[PDB]
Amino acid sequence: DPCSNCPAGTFCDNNRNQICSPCPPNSFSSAGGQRTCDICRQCKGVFRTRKECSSTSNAECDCTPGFHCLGAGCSMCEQDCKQGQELTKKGCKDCSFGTFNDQKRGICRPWTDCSLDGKSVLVQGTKERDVVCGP
Amino acid sequence: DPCSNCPAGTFCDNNRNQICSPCPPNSFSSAGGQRTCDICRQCKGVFRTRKECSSTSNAECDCTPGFHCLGAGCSMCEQDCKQGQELTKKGCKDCSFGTFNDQKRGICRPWTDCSLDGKSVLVQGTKERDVVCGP
Amino acid sequence: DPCSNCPAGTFCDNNRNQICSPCPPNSFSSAGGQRTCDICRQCKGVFRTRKECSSTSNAECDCTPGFHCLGAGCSMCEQDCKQGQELTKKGCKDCSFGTFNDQKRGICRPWTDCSLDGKSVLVQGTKERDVVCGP
Amino acid sequence: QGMFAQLVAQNVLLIDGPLSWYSDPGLAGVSLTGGLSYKEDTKELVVAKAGVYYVFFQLELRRVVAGEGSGSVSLALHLAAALALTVDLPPAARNSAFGFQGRLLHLSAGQRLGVHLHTEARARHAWQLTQGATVLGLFRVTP
C-alpha cells in the first residue's frame, strides 16, 4: 500500500490523497501504515501519568499513592490492602484460616507454632495478628 | 426569523412554507416561534389532572387522594406517610432517635421530657409514640 | 399474490423475480407464501433434539436426562426436582406446610394422620419425610 | 434418719401432663426417708410431717434428632404454682439444656406435691428429657 510508507507519528490521510500527515494533537501511531492516529490515554483522578504521550507512543498510567494497579495495563486502581488482607491479582483478599497479616501492604504468613519453640499459646491469632506465645 | 411572528398556540409549519398553523390536538406551545408544538402531559393512574392542557399551556398533575407529589413538577407519587415517619423532599423517612410521630401525615417532634413537669417516665416512646409520663 | 403459489419447503424469492426457490440449508417454511424461510431451531448443550428440522417443519427440543422442560415449547431446562419439592409450571417448589415428598420427581402429599389408624406420632414430618407413627 | 427425698423422672418424651417418678431408693439418684412417700396413681410426693423444706427441681434436655427442634419446656410444682422453671431449647449449636430452681416452702401435714411438664416447641420429637437428670428434691430445714 502507499500508506505503508507513512511512519510512526503520522497517518495516511484519506482526505489529502494519502499523504503522511503528522498525528493531530493528543494522538499517536506506534506503528506505520495507519489510516488514523489513536487518541492518547489520559491519566486523571485516581490515575496519574507515569509516561507522557508522544506522537509515537501512548501515555501510561499508574495509581496515586495509597492505591495500586489492578488488571490489564492498570485498568483499575484499588486502595492498598490493610491488616488481615494480601494483594492478589484479583484484588485485596482476606488471609485464609491459619494465616495472618499485621502490616499494611503485607503478605499473609502462617501463625507461629508456639510448641516448636517449647512455648504455650496465650492468645490465638486471627487474620490480623499472630498467636501470642508465652513461656 | 419569519417563525418569530407565530404566536403561542401555533407552530411555524415547515411543511406549509412557514405559515403559523394552530397546534394539533393534544399539543401546546407556551411561547411563540416554535417549529413544532409539544405533546400535552397526561395525568393517569395514580396521577390526576390538576390543570387541563390548552393550546398555550401544558396540563399539570397532582396525586390521587392518599398520595402526594415527589420531585420536579410532581414527577412521582408516594403513599402518604404513616405513624413513625415524616414527609421529607426525598420521601417518607423514619423519625430519628428521640423523636416521634403518632399521626398520619404528621411531623416528627421530640419526646416529652416528663421531668420538666415533675413527672416520671412510665413507658419510653418510640418513633410511633410519645413517652407516657406518670405522677 | 404470485407468492401464494410457493408451497411449504420453499420461499417466494424477491431476488429471482418471485420464483419458488427451495429453503436454504438449515431453514424451513411450514406454510406456503413466505418471502423467506425461517432458521431451524438448534437443540444444544442442556437441550437435545427430539424432532429434527425438515424443509417444512422446525426442529423441536426436549431436555437432557436429569432435566425437564419449562414454559413455551421447552424454552428452558430445569434439574429434576428432589426430596421436599414438586414440579409446578413455574418450576420446582417446596411442599407447603403439612405435606411432604420423599422421592425424586415426586408429588407433595399430606402427612399421614397416625390417629386415623389408632397410632401415635413418634417423629413429626417435614417437607422431605412423612410422620413416623408408632403403636 | 433425717427428713429428705429426691425423685428421678421416668418420662423421656416431651408430652404435656404430670410427670411420673422413680421412688425406689435402690435406684441411683433416688432418696426417700420416713415421713415422705410417693403415691404412684396420682404421681404425687406426700409430705407427712408439716414444716419448712428447701424444695428444688432441675431439668436437663438433650437433642435426639440432629438439626431439628426449637422452643421452650417448663416444669411447674403444684401443691398457682409453688415452683416454676422454663428452659429454652436452642435451634441447631449445642445439644443440651439445663435448668435449676430452689426455694424454701412451708408444707402442711399430708401436703401432696405434683409436677407438670409443659412444652411450647416446634418439632418436640427432636428433644427428650435426659434420663436420670430431671429431679425433684427436698430436705427439711425446721427442727
Added chain:
Amino acid sequence: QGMFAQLVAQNVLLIDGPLSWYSDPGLAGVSLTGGLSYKEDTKELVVAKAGVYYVFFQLELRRVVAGEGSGSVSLALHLAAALALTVDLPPAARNSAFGFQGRLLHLSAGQRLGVHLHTEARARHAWQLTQGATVLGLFRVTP
C-alpha cells in the same frame, strides 16, 4: 424453731437501686425465724447469730410490653458482692427469664445483707419483676 429466712421482693419496676422486701411471715412465700430480722429503713436482713449459711437468691422477670425490651438485669448481695447473678432479657420469642444462684457464706454476728438491682436494658418498661418470684433466702448449716 430453726434458723432460716426467705424474703419476697416488693419491687416490680426495673429501677437501679436497693430492693425492698416483704418480711411478714403471714404473707405467702415469706419465712422469718428468731435470730433473723428485717430493717425496713435500710432494706437489710440482719443476722443475729454468727455462722455459715447457705444463702441463695432468684430472679424472675416477665415481658409486660409485647414486642419490646432487650438487654440484661443483675442482682448483687452486699454484706465487693458476696453473691451475684445476671439474667438476660431476650428480644421479642418467649416472655420470661429466670436466674438462680446459691452459696455457703460465713456471716458475722449482726451482719446486714442488702440486695441491689442493676439494669443494662433498652426499653426497661417492657420488662418487670414477676411478683412473688424474686426471693432472697438462707438457712443455717452450722450447729
Added chain:
Amino acid sequence: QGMFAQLVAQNVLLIDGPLSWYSDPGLAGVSLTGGLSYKEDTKELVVAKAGVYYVFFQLELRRVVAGEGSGSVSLALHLAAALALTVDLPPAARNSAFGFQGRLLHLSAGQRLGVHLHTEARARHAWQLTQGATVLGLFRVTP
C-alpha cells in the same frame, strides 16, 4: 462444728482437665469442717463420713478479650458424672456467663470427688473463669 465444705477454684484459663481448688478456710469463700479434706495431688475432696449431702457447683465466666470468644464450657463432678453443667459463652452483647447445679447425693465413706472442666469453644483465650466465683460446695443432710 457441722459437716460441710466449700472450695474455690484456682484455675483461670479455659484448659480441659481437672480443676485445682483452694481449701484453706483462711481464704474468702472457703469452708472446710472436720470429716472433709482436700487431697492436693489428685485434686479431690475426700468425704470421711458416709451419708447424703446436698452437693452443688457454680461456674462464672468473664470475657477477657473484647469482641472475641464463643461456644460453651462444662463442669463435671466425678466420684459416669454425678453432677454436670454446661454454660454458653455468648458471642460479642454482655461479658459474663453463670451456671448453677445442685443435687442430693449419697456419698460413701472415703468417697473422693473430682471436678473436670471441658471447653467446646472458638477463641478460648477470650474467656476466663471469674476468680472466686467457680465453687464446689456441699453440706450433710443425714443426721
